[PDB]
Amino acid sequence: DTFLEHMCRLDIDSPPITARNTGIICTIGPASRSVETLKEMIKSGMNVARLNFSHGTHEYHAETIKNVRTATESFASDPILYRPVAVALDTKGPEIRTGLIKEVELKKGATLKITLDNAYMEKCDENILWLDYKNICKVVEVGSKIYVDDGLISLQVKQKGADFLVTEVENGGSLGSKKGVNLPGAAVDLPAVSEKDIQDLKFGVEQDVDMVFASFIRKASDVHEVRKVLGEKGKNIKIISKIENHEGVRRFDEILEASDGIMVARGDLGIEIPAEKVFLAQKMMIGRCNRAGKPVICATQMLESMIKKPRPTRAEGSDVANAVLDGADCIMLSGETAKGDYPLEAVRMQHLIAREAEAAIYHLQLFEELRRLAPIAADPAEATAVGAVEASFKCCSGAIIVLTKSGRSAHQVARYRPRAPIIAVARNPQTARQAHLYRGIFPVLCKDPVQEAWAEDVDLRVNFAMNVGKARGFFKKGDVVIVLTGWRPGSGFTNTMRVVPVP
Amino acid sequence: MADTFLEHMCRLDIDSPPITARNTGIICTIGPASRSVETLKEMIKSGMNVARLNFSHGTHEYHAETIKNVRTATESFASDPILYRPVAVALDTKGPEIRTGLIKGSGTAEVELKKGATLKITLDNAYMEKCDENILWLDYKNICKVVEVGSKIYVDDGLISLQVKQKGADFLVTEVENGGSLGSKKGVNLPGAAVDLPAVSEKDIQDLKFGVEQDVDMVFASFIRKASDVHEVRKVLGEKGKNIKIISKIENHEGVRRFDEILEASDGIMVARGDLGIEIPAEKVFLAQKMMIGRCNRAGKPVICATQMLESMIKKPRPTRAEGSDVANAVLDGADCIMLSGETAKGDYPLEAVRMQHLIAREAEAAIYHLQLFEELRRLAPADPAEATAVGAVEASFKCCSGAIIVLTKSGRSAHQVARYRPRAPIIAVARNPQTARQAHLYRGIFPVLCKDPVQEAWAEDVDLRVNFAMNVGKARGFFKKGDVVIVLTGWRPGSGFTNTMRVVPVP
Amino acid sequence: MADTFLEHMCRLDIDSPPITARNTGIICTIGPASRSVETLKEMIKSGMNVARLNFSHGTHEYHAETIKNVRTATESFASDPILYRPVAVALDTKGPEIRTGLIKGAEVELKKGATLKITLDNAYMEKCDENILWLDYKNICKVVEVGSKIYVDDGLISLQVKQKGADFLVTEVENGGSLGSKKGVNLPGAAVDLPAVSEKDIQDLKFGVEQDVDMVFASFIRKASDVHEVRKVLGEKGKNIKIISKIENHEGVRRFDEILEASDGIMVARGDLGIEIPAEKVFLAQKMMIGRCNRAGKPVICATQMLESMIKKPRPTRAEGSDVANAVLDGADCIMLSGETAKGDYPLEAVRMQHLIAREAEAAIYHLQLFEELRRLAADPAEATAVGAVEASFKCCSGAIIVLTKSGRSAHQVARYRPRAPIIAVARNPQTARQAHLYRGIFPVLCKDPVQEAWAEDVDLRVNFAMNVGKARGFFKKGDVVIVLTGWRPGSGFTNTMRVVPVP
Amino acid sequence: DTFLEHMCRLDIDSPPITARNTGIICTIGPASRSVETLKEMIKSGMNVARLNFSHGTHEYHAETIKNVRTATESFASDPILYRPVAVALDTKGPEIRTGLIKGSGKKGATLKITLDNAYMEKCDENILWLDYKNICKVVEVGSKIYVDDGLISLQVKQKGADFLVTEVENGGSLGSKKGVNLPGAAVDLPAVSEKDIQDLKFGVEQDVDMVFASFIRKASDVHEVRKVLGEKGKNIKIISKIENHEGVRRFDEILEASDGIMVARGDLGIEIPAEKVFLAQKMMIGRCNRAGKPVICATQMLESMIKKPRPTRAEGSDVANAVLDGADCIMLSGETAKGDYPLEAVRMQHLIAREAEAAIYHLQLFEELRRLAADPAEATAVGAVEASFKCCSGAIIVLTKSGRSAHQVARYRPRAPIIAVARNPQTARQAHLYRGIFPVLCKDPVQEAWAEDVDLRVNFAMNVGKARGFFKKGDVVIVLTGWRPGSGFTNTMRVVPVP
Ligand SMILES: N[C@@H](Cc1ccccc1)C(=O)O
Ligand SMILES: N[C@@H](Cc1ccccc1)C(=O)O
Ligand SMILES: [K+]
Ligand SMILES: [K+]
Ligand SMILES: [K+]
Ligand SMILES: [K+]
């Protein structure tokens, strides 16, 4: 009844009892591409496979996607135990790159002039450096820092020109070729969708991906440019906006209102804004996502140590758990599953931490705040969704069963953070897969034929859900579940709630 | 102020500075980087509240002089009592440590232990100064009696790990699991070994008697596993040391299993996260930390988070994003104090580490929803006159948007009682006793000030003078200004009584 | 909508019409003044929900005709089913009454200090004056002793026994007043122990079964076993008739819990309680019994000393208005009118005044607190949906909760939790339609339409019926929202289906 | 707990456990004005003596006041047991009277209202006079006119220069010089009559505690009374009587102007439909409780007890409901002034109001009154009441100068009694206007040292509470005092064990 008493009763020497409710997203690459590893990653709890289009060809990604689907459909022969697995396309997005040295040393002792003049784009050195961002000179000033190679080189602009910068180095070191630059000042005006991104996104539509992780989102109009490129054929593809610099954090509200969800890229924010502040930015963006009922993913610097070790550090378990407790919907693994020595061990550990963290979630408190921050009255569907969550607490329910076309009704229930799992029963395979983005939704794909009597159809899907719930040990005979259904086909939105005994 | 925890998170702004003070204590380990009068002065100005001496190293003479330097730097500010910050001295015991020997030769300094290599562990004294890739001496004579084939051995705060492949009479052959650079005299952990070293050794008796002799404010008692360990320390401190606070360090699994009895015997707790990471997996340590902070917050006993704080700042002038987040989350869990180790003791940026610890603790204060902490700490309490007065002072602090709660205190008890309930407003604890002003730093939200003026014959005039002093301090630290309200807590009439007196006074 | 009760009292305006429906039921006693088809029609129009027949007086033949007149008057509205108002019939039992006889040949005044003789001799039974009094309790001489006390005319007169005489009793008039023919008599401190169910009550209860009454008001209930005797007499044929136990004495109050748990509901008879319980206490018994009834979700009727001035006057006193309003504010489901409608000169006027007061009192009910408290003093699938439906009626500022019910249980379950919004209960069973008037906030409507083949179709027709009733009654208009509760399948046990439906 | 569980737990066979916390005001007249009866009414719980200046000469009222003070001071020898007793002056106020001669004079009839001063003492069931000049200027077609105690209703058809044309609506006998009420009508009569001015100045000279100002219709009537009481009478409490529709309409500005309010239900019931007065009563008590101003319920309380030694069920229920509505005080009129059972009427008022206390859910009142920090004063008051609940204290002890501190605590409606220790006798008397204040008069000399003077007054309250059965040794009380001699408010809170 008190958060403090929940913390006081935490017991490291008893196994975690509540289900993992947060999604696991795994970057698939060389170490994890193979069908056999992919099957093991699915059984160990991967919900979403991420393809990082910063590297690899279309051919290479097509085969990864084929292995992901082969590994996923290997479990299809049991509809009660089959777990849907979503496919995520993560774009390269806009970059600023230095181009070719003829590496070199660097210290303040010599000033570094930055030039954009294409006749210098292969003769980079400690005296003159080339940059591929033609419009740099408009968006920087004489106070502004310039980070080179993932923040290990910092500069400080002293003379701004029309098409040149005079800097002087801080935090010097070993500058090499084609290194990534960051401008903490920000308001960079690079397109939003690079030439490669438009091809990549078209391939995404053809490969039938469930969602896009759109890199370097700075404003609402970037999200709407990705939407427009995905076009009419891609309109049901979820757009997750990646927040990676200071301007994204500052314009968070317009990006959130434009997006299907959000990814917080902590390592990227680590470069752009001070370390004493990134934790506030993460707690802020997760809170605003929770309030809006929109999925938020925490990404980068999760279990990096597990690229080379089979167990993570104390600090990594704490950072991952504290992301769950901030209210993240999903946690994403990068190199730990893409290229590291322990891909399967990485998935298993992400699972153990997210599950252990559930002990420290106080569900009723999240609900009471989230219910009080809802509109004054809202539509019918909202009143019903909140009513189903309220009922779930007051009957100590095993689950909330939601029959959904698009997932919207399941999504509405999830925003309110019931303790009870949301078993989202869907015939649409894409909405089954997209559902993994949301804390506390367990999607199941009903393949049964559409009955002709609607009340018979509903009864079959609910029976399906009852069977899934029993097999997963969410509940058993004598328990009560909430059920949310539409009324007759002919009406709009799931506006119908029953409290039903588990037969 | 915001009605929900959620709305409080939603309003966090990285672009606007903090509007709360830094309410958590900063404990800094003093070592070769930091023990100069010059450095200590800067460190006090930048937020250091407690100076920690690590008696794992150094002579009594070395530490006498560090203490001397701490007090010289501290009293250099005594000239203006409105600006004087009390600074406590903590003595951190060796305890039952295992240490490796000295690296041989003159042409390595450190050796590289590599994945899969064989390493022999010897107790043969002929090797205590000839350690290398192949032979490692350590100083725990009965190691071969408490270890088995398969047993894990951890060296240098967990950075190197070994597994015992063969056992001998007076040696162990081991396989390097986790490689690393092994230097001289590193710390060794034997998870699930029944290490038979005593809680209080003869050296620990001598260290604790020297703390009493040097008038230290608090003892950080290393490797506490049970209450009789705490009792043993309290007995060595004896009658002369009866006002010295004992902070029990939880460093292992047994310390966590027997936590309640350790808490009940202790004045406070230090959570050693790194050391817990050796006997306890990563998917479980965050839970240990949250449980022990919560139980401490519930008992009203000070709790310090230590180890693995800003260790990157040993070599760099700025921390990582992960360290900021980890320190912030220890504040948000309800830690009273944060302790720095090598970052201040021996590193290249001791002053930049104190400043960064202050910056992070101050930013973290913006994510604390004080009202919820208070309402929960109020509910979970049973109810003497002193306690209802303190809860009333805290409730009033919130209702009045108080700039502070001024507490006139002899022992510190009344200031501690108020701090237990986690007001938003700073607690200015006005003490005439220099030891209670120093010890007050163990508690979240207490800003101790030492009143140096003599006692007036007239009680009510003595109270106004002391309250006038607090109001000058609060004005100068920018806690409040003319036209704000403060809560004042005092006794009624001279003579040891209940601090039962609450007033709401407008700030002139 | 007020954050606090206090604000809610502060915002009361005497000058602005009422913005809520009249939610409490009106029970009217039908007698010579109110018997006629014509009056009954007018009383139904002015808000009479229940017709009470007092079997303390009259023949089975006489009451047969009153019931016929009520049903004629009621069935005259049937032709528009949107406007038809169910009207229940109640049978109020004699029970173990003690009554004085007839004045000799005019009335007599009993003046303080005087002697008054009570005689067993049936000679004087139609000869009662200032000096001698007959009463109809044959054992009166055997059940009192010198010092014993005796009350008359309901109240107002008090007598102390000075001499006992085998077939006579000599008393002294402690309290005076006028003395009427056939008046009521009380004997506190004497084991009267006349049965709760006499031979005449048996006959009257069997008659009520025959005449298809909706409910029985059982007089002088003192314990659980008295209720079970009434229940037995109604037997199998009368099993769906609602028993309302009248609490009329100190034993009823002391044994309240076992009576409540044995009964379908409770009638608080304030005047009768006033006789053995002092004035400093009766308001506490009234408030306790209404509270416990609200707690148990059982109907509670407040009766006696309501609008008794309106027997002789076209208007009530301010004290009467305040006393009725406070019974409503206490949480009464129904208000009963007695002599005001039975025999007085202003039957229609007393019905209209009862509607005005009850409607104006609704302004001062703090619904949000009642629901929060009844919710906190409560889960079952049945209970969760009902509570959910009331919670949604607040959140959506709904115009009504529409409930499809067979027996009425689902409607009663919603009513226990006390929504602001009216409950339109749609029945096909005319008895459940009638019985639903015992519950605060239920507006019952009778669906005449035949059952549709397809279950979902039939549900949507009934809902659209309630939708049309609500609109005609001004509860809601197009594009307001309402809550709807149904069963799931044709035979689905539990009305467990909740929707929030726009008003078309 | 819930309010519902509170009603459910009520038990009529359980003796009342808690003290009566509402004030009792008794009208003193021929049946009650002897020193002997006054002594008994004070022992039985009378807190305020009301003098009705509608009748009696100044000589008569001066002797009643003298007897009230003789009776009160007869208990002065034991300061632990002495109950302060307040004196209230209740003004005649502006009336409208008919004016006839001879013995006396039933629907229809057609009555004509002449103002023509011809018919001063010559009127009948055709022509009726009255002394209100402007009656024809503030009335229209449809207007009601009541005569006697609303016994007879008229209906104005036609309106002219100096006359009216009406229709008898209710029938009865028409006596001489009988009161006249104008429903929904904005009467422009002077607010303070020439008798009221005399009567108010007599009140100042007699050192009365409070005035009950009759027929208050607007803020400016309250200001007019305040100006007559003047500087000499500035410390006299003005209670505005709400007796008609305009008073109800313009309540917010009358309350802001006034020290407190009297709801005159019987007079409201003439000016206003009977089925609306309970709303008016509940509204004004709620608004008074919100402003922290005393509210008194008056008229139609225990009227049966004029002739009978016990009240009716209806009367018991109407008094109890006035207490449960949030009334600070209940007033008796004829029951104590002129009827046959004046002592019994006081005792029954105590019993009813004490039994009603069982039905008050204290924490709810407080929690709502807190929700609806002005200054350090308000912060100390709220925190005192909070502490009284947490520590389950037997009292809140307030060392009061003006009594403002005590009144500030009483607003938030603690369960625990407020023992208001006053050295100022008028402060002790005026405190009775507030629910839940038990005022005590300290008669000890001021001690040289402020801290010893405080300890003395607290020890005095501690002995009072022990005697009264409020608490016993080892209980806890909340103590509010000033800080230092002459501080502007009771700003200092202690939780102190009862020794
Ligand atoms: N969506 C994830 C997480 C989850 C588990 C259990 C319940 C709800 C959600 C899954 O399907 O496995
Ligand atoms: N003021 C009244 C009422 C009261 C009694 C007891 C306690 C509180 C108030 C009195 O002193 O009698
Ligand atoms: K990418
Ligand atoms: K140490
Ligand atoms: K009867
Ligand atoms: K008067």
The side-by-side strand order for the widest beta sheet of chain A comes to 1-2-3-12-13-14-15-16
User: Can you summarize the main beta sheet of chain A?
Assistant: 8 strands, parallel, barrel
Radius of gyration of chain A: 24 Å
Taking the alpha carbons of the first and last residues of chain A, their distance comes to 31 Å
Provide a count of the helices of chain A.
18
Quote the CATH topology of the largest domain in chain A. TIM Barrel
Give the names of the bound compounds: phenylalanine, potassium ion
| CATH H-level superfamily of the largest domain in chain A | Phosphoenolpyruvate-binding domains
- Most extensive chain contact? C-D, 63 and 61 residues
**Oligomeric description of these chains:** homotetramer
Gross morphology of chain A: elongated
What is the total tally of β strands of chain A? 21
In helices, the fraction of residues of chain A equals: 25-40%
Domain count of chain A: the total is 3
Q: Supply the CATH architecture of the largest domain in chain A.
A: Alpha-Beta Barrel
Structural class of chain A: alpha/beta
> Which CATH class of the largest domain in chain A?
Alpha Beta
Modified residues (Phosphotyrosine) (chain B): 84, 127, 154
Cross-link (Glycyl lysine isopeptide (Lys-Gly) (interchain with G-Cter in SUMO1)) (chain B): 145
Cross-link (Glycyl lysine isopeptide (Lys-Gly) (interchain with G-Cter in SUMO2)) (chain B): 94, 245, 249
EC number (chain B): 2.7.1.40, 2.7.11.1, 2.7.10.2
